[PDB]
């Protein structure tokens, strides 16, 4: 394809109190890119703890009922790009 | 066993909403980590600001923003060779 896939905006680090919801969002250059999220470099295990949202080129990860266990670096991956930010559960 | 095969476990509902209001469909599937596929009249929806696609565990949801009469259609969630359809009527 004419234009190369990349992740456009960067992602800010977030701090949330325990039990509150945390969200990460990023945007990509192309439609029809699948979401792929890592926690500390490893694919997140899908469960009712995580909501994955896509709207247009916006990809969101929603982390429910946070605990100190959720404090980590989260990464979105597509093509040859990736973007990371930290969650601190307070 | 039945769990060796991916399948729809809970259907979505027919729905009516007034113009410009938000509409949503929710179904459930048998397994975690299933991709979402949504159709509008048999054809894959085009990703845009119009549609929010949500997966939470086994729950799959399509949210249709700012409805218009052009949104009135049969929507389908596709789970491999398994499908579920329901109608949005924008009134
Ligand atoms: Ca970038
Ligand atoms: Ca079925």
Residue numbers in the entry:
A (entry chain L): 2 to 91
B (entry chain A): 1 to 91
Q: What text comes from the article?
A:
Evidence accumulated over the past two decades has identified titin as a main coordinator of cardiac muscle homeostasis, and its dysfunction through genetic mutation as an important factor in cardiomyopathy. For this, we examined the unique mSNP T2850I in the I-band domain of titin I10, as a paradigm of an alteration in a general component of the titin chain. Domain I10 does not support specific interactions or have any known specialized roles, so it does not constitute an a priori sensitive locus of the chain. In previous studies, we have shown that the T2580I mSNP destabilizes the affected immunoglobulin (Ig) domain in titin, I10, and speculated that this instability increases the vulnerability of titin to proteolysis in situ potentially leading to myocardial damage.
We calculated a total of 17 molecular copies of I10 originating from two different space groups and diverse non-crystallographic symmetries. The structural features of all 17 molecular copies of I10 were in strict agreement (global RMSD = 0.62 Å for 82 matched Cα atoms across all models, calculated using MUSTANG). T2850 is stabilized in this conformation by two hydrogen bonds: (i) a short, strong bond (2.4 Å) between its side chain hydroxyl and the carbonyl of the previous residue, E2849, and (ii) a second contact between its main chain amide group and the main chain carbonyl of T2897 in the neighbouring EF loop. The side chain hydrogen bond turns the otherwise atomic clash into a productive interaction and permits T2850 to adopt a high-energy conformation within the generously allowed αL Ramachandran region. When mapped onto the crystal structure of I10, the perturbations largely clustered around the mutation site, in the A'B β-turn and the neighbouring EF loop that are interconnected through hydrogen bonds mediated by T2850. This shows that the mutation only introduces modest local distortions in the I10-fold. The large difference in measured thermal stability was difficult to understand, as the exchange involves the removal of a single hydrogen bond (established by the Thr side chain with the main chain of the preceding residue; T2850-OH:CO-E2849) in the otherwise-intact fold.
